[PDB]
Design a protein around this nucleic acid. Structure first.
Ligand SMILES: O=C(O)Cc1ccc(O)c(Cl)c1
Ligand SMILES: O=C(O)Cc1ccc(O)c(Cl)c1
Lengths: 225, 225
DNA sequence: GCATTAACATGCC
DNA sequence: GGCATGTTAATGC
DNA sequence: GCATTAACATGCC
DNA sequence: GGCATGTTAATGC
């Protein structure tokens, strides 16, 4: 029914795969440990039973960038070699379940629906990243930040009297990483939005005091203002 | 064994799915016709038996951008709604095969390997677009153009005496669309590369006269030179 | 560091 | 011959 | 239009 | 208390 993500965190979780972790291999990591080491070739799907993984790509010159965050019931779909150098670290004590190709056949023979759940999980990732490429080719950095707050507000902002609240803990550093904008530009833009009384990004909530202005500004070509 | 793409054209073709098009629905399009209309909700996988599709996303303000090109044995993995407005046009007379969820079950009951072929096709797309996001966040437009020619040369350039040839018909307009660089910047960069005798992009071949210089320049922060 | 604009020139079922 | 692709330099976001 | 740099200030298992 | 996150303005790619 719907394969969408506004942010690259907890893409299409598959809670029913917890009924089949006995067909796969349990593997616990300590906080701070590598689930996937730089240069490690992975050929398993990795189901996250409990915890939190940060998953990054590393370029040849050593540059490192965020791809996504993974939480409980997330799926790392690295069953085959891809050409990318991936580094995935446990942000907390984390339980995984490693599903090889053979082990997946065993799961599908028991439950043919899990096939389509995995397709949904992949589709969601492709829809996210393909749009993000096209969005970066269409809107300027500062506009992409406004567009993110508008879309989170539309999709998950709760009306609370005069305002909308987005119940979400989200740092400026991550906003920058997700939107591809320098963290100092992120600080500047939020300063503006705050002092103009449009939006306040707090520790655990973003509060939108003025959605129609937020939206209007997101429709311009810059908000380096 | 390998889920890679340097360019968003002909991602992981699955030639064996042509053995199962009788389980799905044949649908022929004329050149210039919409395979997916703007705003059309698609819930089928669409296998391209013969021809060529150009597949674009359209934003709310009407901006339109390339996602990818599809050729024979390519797969459009839109089995479920995604939230994106997609517009896909037949660039030539094109035969498709539409596979619903029910129809895919029928295919998998006959050949369990087709499951994993589809996973490979999805993985390849996710690896492409996820890297492209991270690359646009890491390298400047002009550098991304150099990096593309270097990687195509590495991956598919054939040594021909003094040179490498990449046997590929690729317009400046598409290079721009793929790399997210204005077509006039693309023209400028190629002018430079040509007159410095590094590389010549012709109608049906790119010729690299100097791979080590190409590579060296791709390692700098700009080539607006 | 490059997008944009503009005015112009060459390619092409 | 008409519309799509490519060219070059200047201006400032 | 914004990344970068820099020098500084506030947050935090 | 130490290292990570956030702040603000200036400079020019
Ligand atoms: O491994 C890669 O190159 C990309 C990637 C990373 C994480 C995932 O869950 C997927 Cl499906 C792909
Ligand atoms: O439909 C989308 O939002 C993205 C998309 C487009 C084409 C494909 O083949 C896939 Cl797998 C996804």
């Amino acid at each position: 029914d719907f394969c969408g993500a506004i942010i690259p965190d907890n893409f299409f979780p598959i809670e029913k795969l917890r009924n089949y972790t006995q067909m796969g291999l349990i593997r616990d990591f300590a906080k701070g440990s590598a689930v996937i080491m730089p240069g490690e070739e992975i050929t398993s799907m990795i189901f996250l039973v409990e915890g939190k993984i940060k998953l990054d790509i590393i370029f040849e010159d050593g540059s490192e960038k965020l791809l996504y965050y993974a939480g409980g019931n997330s799926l790392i779909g690295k069953l085959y070699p891809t050409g990318n150098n991936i580094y995935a670290t446990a942000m907390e004590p984390t339980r995984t379940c490693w599903f090889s190709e053979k082990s997946l056949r065993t799961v599908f023979r028991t439950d043919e629906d899990m096939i389509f759940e995995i397709f949904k999980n992949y589709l969601t990732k492709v829809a996210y990243y393909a749009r993000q490429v096209a969005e970066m080719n269409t809107y300027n950095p500062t506009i992409r930040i406004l567009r993110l707050f508008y879309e989170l507000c539309s999709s998950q902002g709760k009306r609370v009297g005069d305002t909308y609240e987005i119940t979400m803990p989200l740092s400026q550093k991550s906003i920058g990483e997700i939107t591809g904008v320098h963290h100092v530009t992120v600080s500047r833009v939020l300063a503006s939005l705050k002092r103009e009384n449009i939006l306040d990004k707090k520790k655990n909530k973003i509060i939108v005091y003025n959605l129609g202005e937020l939206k209007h500004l997101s429709e311009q070509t810059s908000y380096y203002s």
